[PDB]
Amino acid sequence: GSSGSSGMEKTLETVPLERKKREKEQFRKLFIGGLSFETTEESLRNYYEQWGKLTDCVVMRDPASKRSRGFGFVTFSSMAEVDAAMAARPHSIDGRVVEPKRAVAREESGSGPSSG
């Protein structure tokens, strides 16, 4: 008789709209979360290179540590491959359990209301 779990995901309300720009990007741009900080652009691509070749792979690095944040973006060549990557969970890289994201519409802190 085993069991246990937990979580906490916000909901938020009222999202600000912006020109956005570059749709093809966000369209074929997935945000990888939990790279272990030991997974570089390549090391990562080496993984997301099977489903498809990433035309652009960026890995965010700690803005304070200046090393690795543990998350980045993977831009596939086609919408099919990426789609395959989406339905290819879970994801294990660097010997750790990661978690990919659509990337589209991502938390973007701001300030000052702009409208009318």
From Swiss-Prot:
It comes from Homo sapiens (Human). The chain holds residues 1 to 103 of 353 of the full protein. Heterogeneous nuclear ribonucleoprotein (hnRNP) that associates with nascent pre-mRNAs, packaging them into hnRNP particles. The hnRNP particle arrangement on nascent hnRNA is non-random and sequence-dependent and serves to condense and stabilize the transcripts and minimize tangling and knotting. Packaging plays a role in various processes such as transcription, pre-mRNA processing, RNA nuclear export, subcellular location, mRNA translation and stability of mature mRNAs. Forms hnRNP particles with at least 20 other different hnRNP and heterogeneous nuclear RNA in the nucleus. (Microbial infection) Involved in the transport of HIV-1 genomic RNA out of the nucleus, to the microtubule organizing center (MTOC), and then from the MTOC to the cytoplasm: acts by specifically recognizing and binding the A2RE (21 nucleotide hnRNP A2 response element) sequence motifs present on HIV-1 genomic RNA, and promotes its transport. The disordered region, when incubated at high concentration, is able to polymerize into labile, amyloid-like fibers and form cross-beta polymerization structures, probably driving the formation of hydrogels. In contrast to irreversible, pathogenic amyloids, the fibers polymerized from low complexity (LC) regions disassemble upon dilution. A number of evidence suggests that formation of cross-beta structures by LC regions mediate the formation of RNA granules, liquid-like droplets, and hydrogels. This is Heterogeneous nuclear ribonucleoproteins A2/B1. The modification Phosphothreonine is found at residue 11. The modification Omega-N-methylarginine is found at residue 45. Sumoylated in exosomes, promoting miRNAs-binding. According to a report, methylation affects subcellular location and promotes nuclear localization. The modification Phosphoserine is found at residues 36, 92. There is a cross-link at residue 29 (Glycyl lysine isopeptide (Lys-Gly) (interchain with G-Cter in SUMO2)). Signal peptide: none annotated. Residues 28-110 form the RRM domain. Homodimer; dimerization is required for nucleocytoplasmic translocation. Identified in the spliceosome C complex. Identified in a IGF2BP1-dependent mRNP granule complex containing untranslated mRNAs. Interacts with IGF2BP1. Interacts with C9orf72. Interacts with DGCR8. Interacts with TARDBP. Interacts with CKAP5. Interacts with TBK1. Interacts with STING1. Interacts with SRC. Interacts with PPIA/CYPA. Interacts (via C-terminus) with FAM76B; the interaction results in retention of HNRNPA2B1 in the nucleus and inhibition of the NF-kappa-B-mediated inflammatory pathway. It is linked to Inclusion body myopathy with early-onset Paget disease with or without frontotemporal dementia 2: An autosomal dominant disease characterized by disabling muscle weakness clinically resembling to limb girdle muscular dystrophy, osteolytic bone lesions consistent with Paget disease, and premature frontotemporal dementia. Clinical features show incomplete penetrance. It comes from the Eukaryota. It is found in: Nucleus; Nucleus, Nucleoplasm; Cytoplasm; Cytoplasmic granule. A motif (Nuclear localization signal) lies at residues 16-22. The modification N-acetylmethionine is found at residue 8.
